[PDB]
Amino acid sequence: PQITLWKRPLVTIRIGGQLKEALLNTGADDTVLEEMNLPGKWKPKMIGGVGGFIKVRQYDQIPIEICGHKVIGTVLVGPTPVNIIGRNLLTQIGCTLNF
Amino acid sequence: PQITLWKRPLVTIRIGGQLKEALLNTGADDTVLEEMNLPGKWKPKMIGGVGGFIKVRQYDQIPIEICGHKVIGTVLVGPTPVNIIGRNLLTQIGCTLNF
Amino acid sequence: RPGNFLQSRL
Numbered sequence: 011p012q013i014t015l016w017k018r019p020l021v022t023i024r025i026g027g028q029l030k031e032a033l034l035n036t037g038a039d040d041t042v043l044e045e046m047n048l049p050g051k052w053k054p055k056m057i058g059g060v061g062g063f064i065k066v067r068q069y070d071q072i073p074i075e076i077c078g079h080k081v082i083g084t085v086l087v088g089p090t091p092v093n094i095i096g097r098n099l100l101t102q103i104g105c106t107l108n109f
Numbered sequence: 110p111q112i113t114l115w116k117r118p119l120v121t122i123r124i125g126g127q128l129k130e131a132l133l134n135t136g137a138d139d140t141v142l143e144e145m146n147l148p149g150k151w152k153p154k155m156i157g158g159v160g161g162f163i164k165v166r167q168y169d170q171i172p173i174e175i176c177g178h179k180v181i182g183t184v185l186v187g188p189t190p191v192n193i194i195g196r197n198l199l200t201q202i203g204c205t206l207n208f
Numbered sequence: 209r210p211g212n213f214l215q216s217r218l
Contacts, residue, residue, distance in 0.1 A: 012207045036135040037135065059191075060189055060215050092214060096212065105114060106208070107112040109110065141215060
């Protein structure tokens with residue numbers, strides 16, 4: 011699809027049969043989702059941008075279905091105020107910024 | 110252009126005759142520039158990020174050039190670590206997310 | 209190192 015930016019680019023995502031809303035965020039290097047259980051090993055990471063940082067957990071090889079596209083990659087989990095799909099997965103779904 | 114997302118989507122902007130690097134940010138409602146002086150009246154505002162809040166100076170009806178597109182809009186100035194072009198201006202240059 | 213620039217109006 012081609013998504014205009016008059017509104018926040020929120021889309022539905024699926025991860026392990028769980029339905030979640032998330033923001034397509036070209037200003038995020040990484041993907042970060044609100045607290046949830048994910049399988050596999052993890053390591054702690056700090057992330058931040060505007061204002062202070064938050065500590066998150068890094069899980070790998072996590073499949074996410076984003077707007078129809080099944081992709082697999084790194085997912086951070088932590089107390090983000092908004093679910094965020096960052097460039098690590100945007101690239102995987104072939105996403106570009108066009109003007 | 111069609112800008113891919115393997116790297117941070119950084120473009121050149123011009124404001125008050127200063128050239129700056131800025132991030133094309135679909136995850137930002139607003140445009141937030143690093144601390145700088147700008148002539149004009151402004152209003153204080155608080156904005157939120159992933160792990161905190163910063164106070165900004167809101168300037169309205171500011172001419173700003175983005176990747177060669179002369180637009181006019183609201184710019185916030187405050188202690189962001191990276192200049193951010195948000196949706197308020199991404200929409201003026203016709204920017205869409207395509208996948 | 210800052211890498212996630214979610215920004216929201218209040």
